[PDB]
């Protein structure tokens, strides 16, 4: 009972209907500035507002090119390209590309998933257009920013039991790539998520150019001049959950934290973090993932990370977020480097909180001398120097199992206690903590 349409104009009325089975015919469809206006294709934002329920939309072999100037055609208002408000919808196989790099007038998201039991599968999304682009979050990601931002993020998962499956999300925009706000039981599965990087040294080389960073003398939002020797993503989170947000289900506005997120078989490359779910409540579960060249690998706060890998070229593979982290169980492989090392954090892992069970595995034999597993201590992390983000650094670790099946050294700080360490080698383990146990393992 599939209805096939051959233009965006004939597609739009179906987005208001329940129980439809619609296919946009293979082809290339362009959305330009002249398509936005009262008498034009798109009079309102979101451009594609899926209000119906129990519908299926087939975008196989559809290329949708959206000119980034459309992000400025709705005044000082947020522009979403796609938003799902209905329930039990399936959208599949769309290839969506932002054309050009024009920044939104306010902010933008490519896709916002509200409602319940929706699935977006097989999408290929290229995100462009944001301001400032080139600094990551160094000069602001919220209010009071050093440089005023106009962010543009990829997929915002909200609602209930919403599902992003087998998608490719490429971001060249300052914003999250995939993030969750007020989402209950979201699932991200089989996705490839990719940003790009820039060194802080390259940013500092803007001295004397009159760039926005040069005009503030490179003073970051963290309270200090941008330090040399770090590799930053130009994006925010690869997959990042919020402890806040607004969603809509069945007409009901809901403000709540993300809860019960699941991330399965995802690859995240060159983002600010691979998988960060520490701010979500409920059960956090991450399995089968690969994090490459991110500033941080896995930070879920509490729950399970199993059969996951990350390299350590730009940041630690593992970070406890706060000293209140409790019950973080993790089995992480430190992968061979995906590119040259540029890790100014001087750690492959930062461990704290209590009652964790942590296994690290690696076949790396060539260990850079600045890389160690830290239990407590003063992490030289880009965003936590000099008292910045104080709850995220310099906290105690107690009652933690640490199985170090790697050649990386371990430093147990004086704030660590009751750490049960097993390790391939114990000669490179420094123990300044209280009542820690260190035992050797064979190979």
Numbering used by the authors: 1 to 443
Kindly provide excerpts from the paper associated with this entry.
FdlA from Flavobacterium sp. SA-0082 is an endo-type fucoidan-degrading enzyme that cleaves the sulfated fuco-glucuronomannan (SFGM) through a lytic mechanism. We show that the FdlA-NTD adopts a right-handed parallel β-helix fold, and possesses a substrate binding site composed of a long groove and a unique alkaline pocket. Our structural, biochemical, and enzymological analyses strongly suggest that FdlA-NTD utilizes catalytic residues different from other β-helix polysaccharide lyases, potentially representing a novel polysaccharide lyase family. Here, we report crystal structures and enzymological characterization of wild type (WT) and eight single mutants of the catalytic N-terminal domain (NTD) of FdlA, revealing its unique substrate binding pocket and identifying the key catalytic residues.
We first measured the enzymatic activity of 12 mutants and found that eight of them (D137A, K141A, H176A, F179A, E236A, R240A, Y242A, and Y242F) almost completely abolished their activities, H279A mutant retained approximately 65% of the activity compared with WT, while mutations of Asn243, Arg272, and Tyr322 to Ala only negligibly affect their activities. In the WT structure, both Asp137 and Glu236 form hydrogen bonds with Arg272, while Arg272 participates in the shaping of the alkaline pocket. In both D137A and E236A mutant structures, the side chain of Arg272 switches to the opposite direction compared with that in WT due to the loss of the acidic residue (Arg272 in E236A mutant also exhibits an alternative conformation similar to that in WT), and partially occupies the deep substrate pocket. These results suggest that the steric hindrance of Arg272 in the two mutants may interfere with the substrate fully entering the pocket and hence the correct positioning of the glycosidic O atom, thus resulting in the complete loss of activities of D137A and E236A mutants.
